[PDB]
Amino acid sequence: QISVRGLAGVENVTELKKNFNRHLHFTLVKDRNVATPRDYYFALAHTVRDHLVGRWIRTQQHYYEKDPKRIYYLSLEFYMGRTLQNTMVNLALENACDEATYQLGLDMEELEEIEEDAGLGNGGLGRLAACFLDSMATLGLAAYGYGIRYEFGIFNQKICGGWQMEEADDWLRYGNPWEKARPEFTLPVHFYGRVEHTSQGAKWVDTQVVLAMPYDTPVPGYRNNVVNTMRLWSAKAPNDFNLGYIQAVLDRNLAENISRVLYPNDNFFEGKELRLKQEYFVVAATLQDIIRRFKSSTNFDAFPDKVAIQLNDTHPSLAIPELMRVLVDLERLDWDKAWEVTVKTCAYTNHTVLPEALERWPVHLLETLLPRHLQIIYEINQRFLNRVAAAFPGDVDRLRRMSLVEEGAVKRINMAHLCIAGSHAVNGVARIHSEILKKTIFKDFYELEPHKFQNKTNGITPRRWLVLCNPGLAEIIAERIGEEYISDLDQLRKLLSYVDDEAFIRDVAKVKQENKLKFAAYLEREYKVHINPNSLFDVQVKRIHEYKRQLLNCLHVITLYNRIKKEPNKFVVPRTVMIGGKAAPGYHMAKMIIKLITAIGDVVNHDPVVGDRLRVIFLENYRVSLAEKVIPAADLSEQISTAGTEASGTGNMKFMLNGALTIGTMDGANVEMAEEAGEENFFIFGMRVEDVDRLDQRGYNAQEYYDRIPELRQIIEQLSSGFFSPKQPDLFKDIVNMLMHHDRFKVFADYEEYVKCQERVSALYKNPREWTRMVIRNIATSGKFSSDRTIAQYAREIWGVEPSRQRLPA
């Protein structure tokens, strides 16, 4: 149908049909009389997977012979979403499979909808990992993602009476045709036990063993025939485990719980033992696999020339003392040489400055669980602090601030400090965030080793985030500038020369229109709710947090509502306000915010005076595959975190790429995006970082805003007095109370500027031609935010490897 989806060659189509029928018969053991749509999905998945395997085997063979430096991307999260369409897109099979399926009388698009998300992450950090794997394969890097094969990923969110309920996400129930179990490469991981000192050094003894079984998933590059591996470990008990009889067998569950479930906290540290076991399990099994591969080429001097380990946040920070343990305890290198190798191997990416996200493990946990690692940690600390003492003699406060060991009722290890001491590079994830690392929370470390600290602004894959989810937009762009921009997104810059082209303005706006009709329809089918597709689609989708200020958005929604009620007969630009995202299960406040949103929707959606001028929708179960649908359909992207709190964001980038305008604060990558498009092409408002700091220095007093802004006061009164909750008048008193007295995120301080700026958005939307021209300027300047750019910068400035666009042979 559309060109970017590749060729439907006669031969190709015939082969796909025959392979489909082969899998349906031999793999699924069905005929056409009994097959369900699910059977059909699986037959297609197996047919497509068969095209990946030869390329997978050739790529892995290529790395064996050439022996390039290998990149190991360690993460507790890989938020992959669906694999089938992505695989078609990257192998250029999309149109052929469309044709083949059509001719067997099936709708490929219906079969696509049957695949479960691989929801092995919370939000930004795990989706980033997924984008990075795509980019590493597209750039020909010898890269491996390593993580945990959780049996249950992020919970499925159901809204019941306006409250979130969590259901287990049983994503393996029907099988995963993408993974290959590799039970032959099972490795032991040790826990508990104790340290004995011999003449022969320290020995870690009387440990409990858990086995780590790896599952490999192929990661295809974009049309280059490279297929890299994502390896996820599963926990299995040893066969002599516990070994009355029955209970010993049933107790195998305690060891296998390690890989059972993803912790569903986004940007929040919970100090539970099972989480620490997860962290150690992935690090220990991964390092042994790393060392094994290196030995198949005694001489550890070359180890950092052959290996890079990237730590995605501090979650795999134990890689540092684990690598020391192996080099010192098992390979018998002396301390200083081991440390040298460790530092040159490891690099740390920080993802947040929020203090509640920082991992600080109680010493007594590490003592019981990983006694040897604790000793290595104290030793790292001592040698590190001796270096601080020598550079800053007499500065006793600096020593206490920089210690890996924090004093207190409970002693704790600061995992961020350990990552910094034990890495040759530390990066933040957007320019302002990296600056903040240098000026505030890692200032002391920056003064000791300025050379360690770098920026690598985040990006997103234009494969998933444009060609896959927005084929119509991909197509009208390709019609003008060709197809090359897909692996070279800077080429979108060529579109600035079409900003005054009537046919292009028309086509951009038509795509948006088609995307909106398609989403409006999807809302009706799967969730029985009726929207005006001529309204402005005002979207905020992301995890529910106080720092993300879904609450600021609510205040605006209520403001529009109160303006309509006051002047019912005035014209207003119609809007559909869509907010979606999951709350962490024990995050009470986040759960109250979901409930407030549904309560506003209960009042606004049923008021006959409002008509179809304003609708408030809560998008249930927000996840990667819902993002693929709602983002192409958006007009306005809400990115309204208090300046200084969103390290980067990546949602902001998805929407820029897909033809939405942005209203946001100067936070995170919003700053770079505004600089790329021009500030006049962006809806910037609110305090800057400097403003937040000024306000904190004299004290934030929310009452001042309440006293001076009558629109704001009316909103608070409505909330307090039961307007949004007639059956429980005081239902929202925690929200009000927090806003008036305990708001770390300064919702009221940004309210006036926000509402004003929202009026400018409305004014521009009345003028379709100028809106679409500003959109074109956004899309045309989104090149920088390709994760292909990000990855090339990690490769050159951290890993010391050269990216390559060369295709391997077919």
Ligand X SMILES: *Cc1c(COP(=O)(O)O)cnc(C)c1O
Ligand Y SMILES: O=c1cc(-c2ccccc2)oc2cc(O)c(O)c(O)c12
- Pair 746, 642: CB distance under 8 Å: yes
**C-alpha span between 137 and 230 (Å, rounded):** 11
Return the number of the residue (23 or 789) whose C-beta is nearest ligand X: 789
DSSP E strand stretches across 609-695? 614-619, 636-639, 661-664, 683-684
- Pair 682, 485: CB distance under 8 Å: no
Q: How far is the CB of 632 from ligand X (least distance, A)?
A: 13
Identify which range of 44-52, 123-131, 551-559, 757-765 contacts ligand X by CB under 6 A: 123-131
Sign of CA dihedral 262, 264, 269, 272: negative
DSSP string covering 502-567, please? HHHHHHHHHHHHHHHHHHHHHHHHHH-----TTSEEEEEES---TTTTHHHHHHHHHHHHHHHHHS
802 belongs to the binding site for ligand Y (CB under 6 A): no
Site map 531..550 versus ligand Y, x via CB under 6 A? --------------xxx---
Identify which range of 125-133, 160-168, 432-440, 488-496 contacts a copy of itself by CB under 8 A: 160-168
Of 40-59, binders to a copy of itself (CB under 8 A) are 50, 53-54, 56-57
Return the number of the residue (677 or 702) whose C-beta is nearest ligand Y: 702
Return the number of the residue (536 or 593) whose C-beta is nearest ligand Y: 593
**C-alpha span between 239 and 472 (Å, rounded):** 54
Q: Which does 76 bind (CB under 5 to 8 A by kind): a copy of itself, ligand X, ligand Y, none?
A: none
**C-alpha span between 415 and 646 (Å, rounded):** 21
**Residue 293 assigned ligand-binding role:** yes
Site map 540..579 versus a copy of itself, x via CB under 8 A? ----------------------------------------
261 belongs to the binding site for ligand Y (CB under 6 A): no
Q: Which does 244 bind (CB under 5 to 8 A by kind): ligand X, a copy of itself, ligand Y, none?
A: a copy of itself
Contact pick of 239, 296, 297, 806 for a copy of itself (by CB under 8 A): 239
- Pair 509, 776: CB distance under 8 Å: no
Return the number of the residue (43 or 677) whose C-beta is nearest a copy of itself: 43
**C-alpha span between 726 and 721 (Å, rounded):** 9
370 belongs to the binding site for ligand X (CB under 6 A): no
Q: Taking the chain, what is the end-to-end CA distance rounded to the nearest angstrom?
A: 25
**Residue 498 assigned ligand-binding role:** no
Return the number of the residue (167 or 802) whose C-beta is nearest a copy of itself: 167
Return the number of the residue (169 or 788) whose C-beta is nearest ligand Y: 169
Contact pick of 176, 267, 470, 725 for ligand Y (by CB under 6 A): 267
Q: Which does 623 bind (CB under 5 to 8 A by kind): ligand X, a copy of itself, ligand Y, none?
A: ligand X
- Pair 86, 97: CB distance under 8 Å: no
Site map 578..617 versus ligand X, x via CB under 6 A? ----------------------------------------
Q: How far is the CB of 268 from ligand Y (least distance, A)?
A: 3
**C-alpha span between 87 and 104 (Å, rounded):** 21
Collapse the DSSP code of 372 into the 3-class scheme (helix H, G, I; strand E, B; otherwise coil) and give the result.
Answer: helix
Identify which range of 183-191, 262-270, 284-292, 457-465 contacts ligand Y by CB under 6 A: 262-270
Exposed, middle or buried, 395 (CB in 10 Å: 0-12/13-18/19+)?
middle
Q: Which does 417 bind (CB under 5 to 8 A by kind): a copy of itself, ligand X, ligand Y, none?
A: none
Size of interface with ligand X, in residues (CB under 6 A): 11
Site map 647..686 versus a copy of itself, x via CB under 8 A? ----------------------------------------
Contact pick of 357, 599, 624, 761 for ligand X (by CB under 6 A): 624
Size of interface with ligand Y, in residues (CB under 6 A): 11
Identify which range of 265-273, 303-311, 463-471, 720-728 contacts ligand Y by CB under 6 A: 265-273
Q: Which residues are known to be catalytic?
A: 351, 542-543, 548, 650, 654
DSSP at 408: S
Pairing type for strands 683-684 and 661-664 reads parallel
236 belongs to the binding site for a copy of itself (CB under 8 A): yes
- Pair 507, 736: CB distance under 8 Å: no
**C-alpha span between 107 and 426 (Å, rounded):** 48
Breaks in the chain (C–N beyond 2.5 Å) sit after 243, 297
**C-alpha span between 204 and 569 (Å, rounded):** 78
Return the number of the residue (231 or 542) whose C-beta is nearest ligand X: 542
623 belongs to the binding site for ligand X (CB under 6 A): yes
* CB proximity list for 233: less than 8 A, separation 6 or greater: 146, 147, 148, 149, 212, 213, 214, 215, 259, 281, 282, 285, 286
**C-alpha span between 778 and 677 (Å, rounded):** 6
Site map 23..42 versus a copy of itself, x via CB under 8 A? --xx--xxx----x-x----
The residue assigned the tokens 């989810």 is 469
Q: How far is CA 214 from CA 63, 188, 228, 639, 704, in A?
A: 19, 12, 15, 38, 58
Return the number of the residue (72 or 152) whose C-beta is nearest a copy of itself: 152
Kindly state the tokens that stand for 172.
């393996």
**Closest Cα partner for 59 from 183, 220, 216?**
220
Collapse the DSSP code of 750 into the 3-class scheme (helix H, G, I; strand E, B; otherwise coil) and give the result.
Answer: helix
**C-alpha span between 721 and 732 (Å, rounded):** 9
Q: How far is the CB of 357 from ligand Y (least distance, A)?
A: 7
CA atoms within 13 A on the CB side of 138: 27
- Pair 445, 350: CB distance under 8 Å: no
Nearest residue to the partner ligand X, using Cβ: 651
Return the number of the residue (72 or 655) whose C-beta is nearest ligand X: 655
Q: Which does 174 bind (CB under 5 to 8 A by kind): ligand Y, ligand X, a copy of itself, none?
A: a copy of itself
**Residue 292 assigned ligand-binding role:** yes
Collapse the DSSP code of 743 into the 3-class scheme (helix H, G, I; strand E, B; otherwise coil) and give the result.
Answer: coil
* CB proximity list for 764: less than 8 A, separation 6 or greater: 661, 770, 771, 774
Identify which range of 119-127, 206-214, 233-241, 339-347 contacts ligand X by CB under 6 A: 119-127
Contact pick of 362, 533, 574, 585 for a copy of itself (by CB under 8 A): 585
Residue length of the chain: 810
**Residue 535 assigned ligand-binding role:** no
Contact pick of 79, 587, 655, 732 for ligand Y (by CB under 6 A): 587
**Residue 199 assigned ligand-binding role:** no
**C-alpha span between 705 and 740 (Å, rounded):** 9
CA atoms within 13 A on the CB side of 225: 12
Of 163-222, binders to a copy of itself (CB under 8 A) are 165-168, 170, 173-175, 180-181, 183-184
Q: Which does 587 bind (CB under 5 to 8 A by kind): ligand X, ligand Y, a copy of itself, none?
A: ligand Y
Kindly state the tokens that stand for 429.
């994830």
Return the number of the residue (166 or 444) whose C-beta is nearest a copy of itself: 166
Q: How far is the CB of 354 from ligand Y (least distance, A)?
A: 5
**Residue 240 assigned ligand-binding role:** no
Q: Which residues does the annotation place in the binding site for AMP?
A: 31, 64, 292-297
User: Where on the chain is the footprint of a copy of itself (CB under 8 A)?
Assistant: 25-26, 29-31, 36, 38, 50, 53-54, 56-57, 61, 152, 155-156, 165-168, 170, 173-175, 180-181, 183-184, 236-237, 239-241, 243-246, 248-250, 252-253, 257, 260-261, 263-264, 272, 274, 585-586
Q: Which residues does the annotation place in the binding site?
A: 31, 64, 292-297
User: Where on the chain is the footprint of ligand Y (CB under 6 A)?
Assistant: 265, 267-268, 354, 356, 545-547, 584, 586-587
User: Where on the chain is the footprint of ligand X (CB under 6 A)?
Assistant: 123-124, 127, 542, 623-624, 627, 649-651, 654
